[PDB]
Design a protein around this ligand. Structure first.
Ligand SMILES: O=C(O)c1cccc2c1O[B-](O)(O)[C@@H](SCc1ccccc1)C2
Ligand SMILES: [Cl-]
Ligand SMILES: [Cl-]
Ligand SMILES: [Zn+2]
Ligand SMILES: [Zn+2]
Ligand SMILES: [Zn+2]
Length: 232
């Protein structure tokens, strides 16, 4: 097709995909419980610098990510935001820090990462602890929709491009059964998704944490999958 998939990406390689002017996704792959999964993050041009959303799921992949950014874009990554505390979002933070990137997460994410033993972004994102909270972070808005995939999950909106990055709280359309839900709040996840719809109804591109981008139709789709799992 056009968007990169697992079959195209050996573990250890990273692809970039331009979504809109000054907005890319990054796509990596990783082994998990006997299978290989793709995983997305985001890159947003921030003047003559770059803002990174999420690691590429591990130190080796994140080093490859920084090299691909330098090759293909050539602007410095100065800040990064991790959208929750799991390894596909913070695994590789130490590589970012060693490369001079100022790494950020909410206090909720930093607390959960510490308890779990995952890498801990250094700087705090305040103003996001209550469902419905939004704060500006340069060329993006950060939004805490409520507990969903995890209790700390954030979504990221790029207003200049109408790109909504949903992270692991939003599933791609071809996913028809739940992904990893060990730390999820199944009871609240649909309510949290509806908060995203109410806050970003103008979004034109919606990027899931794993798999193919689409539009806002990914939201009701995710709710339908989560409700089906709830009823297992
Ligand atoms: O997003 C998904 O659904 C997804 C699916 C497969 C692997 C992964 C996924 O994302 B994540 O952030 O949960 C992570 S596993 C997080 C975890 C691991 C072990 C014990 C508890 C929690 C990587
Ligand atoms: Cl700083
Ligand atoms: Cl559906
Ligand atoms: Zn997760
Ligand atoms: Zn700093
Ligand atoms: Zn995930």
């Amino acid at each position: 097709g056009e968007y990169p998939t697992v079959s195209e990406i050996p573990v250890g390689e990273v692809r970039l995909y331009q979504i809109a002017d000054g907005v890319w996704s990054h796509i990596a792959t990783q082994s998990f419980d006997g299978a290989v999964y793709p995983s997305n993050g985001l890159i947003v041009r921030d003047g003559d610098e770059l803002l990174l959303i999420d690691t590429a799921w591990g130190a080796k992949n994140t080093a490859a990510l920084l090299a691909e950014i330098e090759k293909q874009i050539g602007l410095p990554v100065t800040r990064a935001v991790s959208t929750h505390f799991h390894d596909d979002r913070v695994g590789g933070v130490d590589v970012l820090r060693a490369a001079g990137v100022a790494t950020y997460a909410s206090p909720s994410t930093r607390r959960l990462a510490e308890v779990e033993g995952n890498e801990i972004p250094t700087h705090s994102l305040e103003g996001l602890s209550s469902s419905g909270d939004a704060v500006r972070f340069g060329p993006v808005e950060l939004f805490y929709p409520g507990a969903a995939h995890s209790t700390d999950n954030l979504v990221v909106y790029v207003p200049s491009a109408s790109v909504l990055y949903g992270g692991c709280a939003i599933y791609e359309l071809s996913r028809t059964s739940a992904g990893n839900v060990a730390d999820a709040d199944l009871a609240e996840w649909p309510t949290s998704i509806e908060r995203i719809q109410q806050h970003y109804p103008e979004a034109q591109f919606v990027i899931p944490g794993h798999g193919l981008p689409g539009g806002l139709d990914l939201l009701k789709h995710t709710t339908n999958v989560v409700k089906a799992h709830t009823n297992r």
